[PDB]
């Protein structure tokens with residue numbers, strides 16, 4: 262037992278990380294087969310930057326790619342949306358099985374924070390409803406990726422591009438398409454209002470019950486409509502029948518009907534926690550999906 | 565910016581993980597050069613188990629070691645305290661530079677949770693003052709290790725052995741010596757009373773200030789003695805002058821004297837948080853060391 266914010270093992274991704282330098286700008290690239298993927302704002306020059314203009318003015322040799330202490334020769338470049346694709350003369354021998362997938366708000370992933378092509382740390386993140394992520398990123402971390410692992414296959418979902426004024430983070434999928442209404446220029450962009458991921462809170466309440474926290478349970482129940490009236494009032498997003506269905510296995514393992522857990526969440530929203538904690542938190546946690554809870558409270562590995 | 569519970573990249577450790585089977589018992593082993601390290605309670609037989617007796621009754625071939633889908637031939641075995649050392653005929657070609665270090669309560673490390681020799685997840689843990697760790701471990705996770713990384717060198721500090729009745733976890737250093745007053749038998753052992761790691765709370769308050777949370781600051785100050793009178797009352801462990809010294813760099817970066825931050829912690833203990841949060845937590849967090857804060861709020865990598 263126990264319940265922790267758990268990231269996927271990062272080794273498969275560590276072997277893909279490289280350093281991309283243009284002029285005085287250095288960030289991280291993702292090296293899969295003979296292509297290095299990186300944010301297009303690495304494109305250097307001596308807001309209003311036209312990246313097509315900037316790139317046509319560039320040569321292959323303007324991009325220095327370092328894989329550890331080995332320099333990768335760039336033989337081609339192209340732009341795909343907000344990412345650069347640097348064709349290199351060497352296929353990465355550590356390329357894992359992978360996919361480029363775009364995730365939904367509410368979904369979680371692991372981030373391998375990197376600087377100068379060197380992995381620094383790994384942590385778990387959720388895509389917020391407003392398409393930001395509450396990450397930990399400093400100068401030079403751009404090009405770090407987010408991912409999930411499913412047996413032996415790495416599903417890359419996120420590449421880091423920028424920080425917004427509230428200290429949250431914005432980026433693209435691996436085809437270069439931004440999550441949310443953000444652009445890779447310097448403007449007055451701001452996150453926009455967020456909501457709490459209701460189905461995830463319920464999943465985490467089920468994790469708590471699995472782990473012996475039961476004090477928040479009650480004998481009351483509620484209808485889905487009646488619950489969603491309360492969710493709206495506390496800035497929780499609506500719960501759908503599909504969310505209820507997704508919570509079925511957790512309901513069945515604990516013997517607590519989904520709508521009964523909703524009754525508990527309702528009382529937690531209306532009353533607070535009265536000095537108590539759930540799974541070591543004094544807040545309702547919304548960054549664990551039902552899959553995350555099942556994975557951890559049952560123990561799936563990856564190879 | 566941002567602040568997250570960050571683990572070290574796990575790739576160097578993933579390449580050391582193997583599966584050790586004796587009879588019907590399967591757990592994880594750590595394969596470094598030509599030795600596999602694993603908890604001695606894997607020693608199988610068909611509480612009061614005398615492990616010396618059990619081991620002398622065993623043969624090399626009684627231990628099945630699987631490195632992925634490759635079987636490792638055991639050529640020797642020995643007991644060192646509470647760990648088994650299985651000598652195998654093949655040196656692990658992925659052996660990183662490493663050390664076996666024993667950590668202090670208050671210190672943090674990353675855990676690579678493993679099942680059947682296959683890594684499942686990675687998360688950050690602290691050694692509690694009572695020598696337990698609040699982990700996430702299911703059946704089969706024994707032999708998973710905790711570690712820190714310092715440039716290219718892996719400092720192994722923890723190997724997992726058991727769960728205590730409160731759902732917390734106990735284990736050994738890599739020389740087989742238990743952390744805390746626990747034994748690898750089935751008895752009525754229990755964790756024993758814990759305290760909050762004061763110096764770490766202060767480090768995390770400094771992380772908050774670095775990240776823009778300032779509402780808990782105040783103009784008051786306190787003496788070290790006066791602060792420690794309040795710490796005792798709230799089950800915080802005493803703050804020493806060396807803790808104050810260790811917090812110096814964080815003090816200097818923020819311009820907030822250590823004893824001034826103590827005044828803030830004092831008011832937080834006496835008043836609670838009044839519906840506010842710090843770094844996304846409604847509790848005072850004590851599982852980040854001053855080193856962890858500096859590492860994350862400055863960005864050290866590892867290669």
Ligand SMILES: *[C@H](O)[C@H](C[C@@H]1CCNC1=O)NC(=O)[C@@H]1CC2(CCCCC2)CN1C(=O)OCc1ccccc1
Nearest residue numbers: 288302398399400401402403422423424445446447565
């Ligand atoms: C890439 O390494 C870097 C990552 C930032 C630094 C601080 N936290 C992060 O996540 N990304 C940037 O600096 C991007 C690049 C930018 C200029 C070029 C076009 C796109 C946008 C500016 N930018 C950015 O994040 O600006 C906000 C910011 C916040 C704090 C510190 C520095 C910059």
Ligand SMILES: *[C@H](O)[C@H](C[C@@H]1CCNC1=O)NC(=O)[C@@H]1CC2(CCCCC2)CN1C(=O)OCc1ccccc1
Nearest residue numbers: 262591605701702703704705706725726727748749750
């Ligand atoms: C090793 O994989 C396993 C890890 C446990 C299972 C549940 N959570 C964990 O961290 N360790 C054990 O099962 C140890 C072995 C034990 C018997 C042999 C001598 C030493 C102690 C019993 N034990 C244990 O953890 O018992 C408590 C427990 C708690 C919950 C479920 C099962 C067992």
